[PDB]
């Protein structure tokens, strides 16, 4: 008889709300069975009771490490259903803050993985940069993480007059922080022994098990949604896609570090190419008018009233919209019935498929190896449980 | 366009093998990591002296709600219930009636701050800048009931924080 | 920063790079917290004439999906959902890490 162990939810390496039932022979892991739903809030049913604008903060709270990216995916789905187009400056702002959000998420992922394995120091070094990016969020929206800035017509407000300079100041220094992190981890033999050939997944198994993002690219699969199916302005920025060779934790760590570097590159390009113009679609039946117009113009007041009480109507239909979120492929299957409330909203999170395959990746490994494998999948249970 | 992260093999020169052996036997990478930690030890820490020093904020910051007035002292709120209709959490409850002078004013204005998600949709919807999210964020209570705000509490919050709320509005209403 | 020169040399030697060039703390190069007011231009539809809403209303151009092969009712080469994806290029900027 094997030993049966509860790993979490009250466990430092359980990411809060995971109940991993493990069957162990000694310390060898014979079986992993993840019990989830300890953070299931019934988000989709609640969304069915809100208008399209009211449902937006739910996507903030879905993956609370990548907020603007969830907002962007939801907004792209709603724009596709509405047959409208955001203005170019809004698209550049969206891509800039999506890359900043990618930096935030990759910092969180790498530092928490190192903390779980035992390297407690880079967490503190990189969370100061995370704090500065939270300051950027708060300056643009008034909230440190739950901005609700990206809307299904563009963005809520324009950038404050000194924000681009501060973003440039942060970006010209972030590379040295990445360099210090790599000096800490990249060539350390303890880190490599903990990560090399751990959680090895083949390309075919990754494709069949529904993996996406880094979980694919570490196995050598040359795939990235921003390159193959670009959405906002990603066809106007130049960056490189890191590709793994061994399919293990070490290759995924290297891929994430290089993706942080590439996000810095894209942020530079977005900073240089920010255009002028309006920030939300010039269609007052979808985007609210300015406050000065609402207090002067009868049509503007009527449309403000109707947009903030009933909302805009979305023509009947169904869409599946996916983006390259920092954790993989984040998708929304959105069904509208012609009303101002969504009929059905199914959220596809990469964490669901990645966690459904934890048992496969943990075969023939120890307890510490399973901790490393949980860390390398970049799991946030707000999006897994919904 | 893609690049490889881990597709480099090492040189088989005798001297290169000697450096690798010296690194294995003498732990040069671990000394490098210790040096990084030591260099961080002599840097100035990033800690601030709370509560005597505060983290930076912005005029757009969303915090404790308040009900505002016109300069004459009359309440701005006219009980249109736009904030109540837009609230994603259904945290606002409003009851109104004609006032003694016939003005259209609320009799109940409640915000459940344990339901509120602090999104600020209410102050975007409001046509007269009546309800706002203030700059205060240090209002933790010792009981749950203290976080169920009624109209008296919100008007008191407005009267208390107006000198800052108005100045914050002045610096951001041109972006709105 | 306000560090002594010898401490700066020790930090630079321990880290292996020049720390004073890129400080994590922000002293004075940041933007001022009081800014002049903006102007925020208007969108393309703010014209006074030739601006009828029926010419710029995307929501009404949306159509129900076009039915292909309803079941209620030569060569003929095979087809694919799209042309094959092109092979990627190997990073002239930096091909190997």
């Amino acid at each position: 008889s094997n030993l049966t162990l509860n790993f979490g939810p009250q466990h430092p390496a359980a990411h809060g709300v995971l109940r991993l039932v493990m069957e162990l022979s000694g310390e060898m892991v014979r079986k992993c069975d993840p019990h989830i739903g300890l953070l299931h809030r019934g988000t989709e049913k609640l969304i069915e009771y809100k208008t399209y604008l009211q449902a937006l903060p739910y996507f903030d709270r879905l993956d609370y490490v990548s907020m603007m990216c969830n907002e962007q995916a939801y907004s792209l789905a709603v724009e596709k259903l509405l047959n409208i187009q955001p203005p170019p400056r809004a698209q550049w702002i969206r891509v800039l803050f999506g890359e900043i959000t990618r930096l935030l998420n990759h910092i969180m992922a790498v530092t928490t993985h190192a903390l779980d394995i035992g390297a407690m120091t880079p967490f503190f070094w990189m969370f100061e940069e995370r704090e500065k990016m939270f300051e950027f969020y708060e300056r643009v929206s008034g909230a440190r993480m739950h901005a609700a800035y990206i809307r299904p017509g563009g963005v809520h407000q324009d950038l404050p007059l000194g924000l681009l300079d501060d973003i440039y100041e942060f970006s010209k220094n972030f590379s040295f922080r990445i360099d210090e992190l790599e000096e800490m981890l990249t060539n350390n033999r303890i880190w490599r022994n903990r990560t090399v050939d751990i959680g090895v997944v083949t390309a075919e198994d990754a494709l069949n098990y529904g993996f996406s993002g880094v979980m694919l690219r570490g196995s050598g699969i040359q795939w990235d949604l921003r390159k193959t199916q670009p959405y906002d302005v990603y066809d106007q920025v130049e960056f490189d896609v890191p590709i793994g060779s061994r399919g293990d934790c070490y290759d995924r760590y290297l891929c994430r570090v290089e993706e942080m570097r590439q996000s810095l590159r894209i942020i530079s390009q977005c900073l240089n190419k920010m255009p002028p113009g309006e920030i939300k679609v010039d269609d007052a039946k979808v985007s609210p008018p300015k406050r000065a117009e609402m207090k002067t113009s009868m049509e503007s007041l009527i449309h403000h009233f109707k947009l903030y009480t009933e909302g805009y109507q979305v023509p009947p239909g169904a869409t599946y919209t996916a983006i390259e979120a920092p954790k993989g492929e984040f998708g929304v299957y959105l069904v509208s019935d012609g009303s101002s409330r969504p009929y059905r909203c199914k959220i596809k999170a990469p964490g669901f498929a990645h966690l459904a395959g934890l048992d496969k990746m943990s075969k023939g490994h120890m307890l510490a190896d399973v901790v490393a494998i949980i860390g390398t999948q970049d799991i946030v249970f707000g999006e897994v449980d919904r | 366009t893609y690049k490889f992260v881990n597709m480099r093999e090492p040189s088989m020169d005798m001297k290169s093998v000697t450096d690798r052996a010296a690194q294995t036997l003498l732990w040069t990478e671990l000394v490098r990591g210790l040096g990084m930690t030591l260099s961080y030890l002599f840097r100035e820490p990033a800690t601030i002296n709370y509560p005597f020093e505060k983290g930076p904020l912005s005029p757009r910051f969303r915090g404790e709600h308040a009900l505002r007035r016109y300069p004459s002292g009359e309440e701005r709120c006219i009980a249109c219930k736009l904030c109540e209709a837009v609230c994603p959490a259904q945290a606002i409850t409003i009851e109104a009636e004609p006032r003694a002078d016939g003005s259209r004013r609320t009799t109940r204005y409640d915000i459940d701050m344990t339901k509120c998600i602090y999104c600020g949709f209410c102050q975007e919807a409001c046509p007269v800048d009546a309800i706002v999210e203030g700059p205060n964020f240090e209002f933790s209570t010792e009981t749950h009931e203290e976080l169920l705000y009624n109209k008296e509490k919100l008007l008191n919050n407005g009267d208390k924080w107006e000198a800052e709320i108005a100045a914050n509005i002045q610096a951001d209403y041109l972006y709105r | 920063a306000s560090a002594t020169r010898v401490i700066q040399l020790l930090r630079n030697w321990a880290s292996g790079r020049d720390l004073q060039a890129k400080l994590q703390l922000r002293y004075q190069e940041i933007s001022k917290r009081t800014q002049p007011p903006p102007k925020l231009p208007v969108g393309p539809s703010h014209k006074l004439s030739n601006n009828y809403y029926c010419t710029r209303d995307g929501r009404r151009e949306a159509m129900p999906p076009s039915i292909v092969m309803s079941s209620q009712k030569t060569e003929k080469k095979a087809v694919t959902p799209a042309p094959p994806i092109k092979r990627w290029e190997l990073s002239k900027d930096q091909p190997y890490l």
């Binding site: 681009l164 010209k172 590159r265 942020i267 | - | 292996g16």
Partner: peptide, 29 residues
């Protein structure tokens, strides 16, 4: 009469942002 004021990059552009990995050799034989 005043012109449009908006948050924009300076005339020309920003200076280059370093992103490539940097690790010096820093060792004896």
């Amino acid at each position: 009469a005043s012109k449009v004021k908006q948050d924009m990059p300076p005339p020309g552009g920003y200076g280059p942002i370093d992103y490539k990995r940097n690790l010096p050799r820093r060792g004896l034989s």
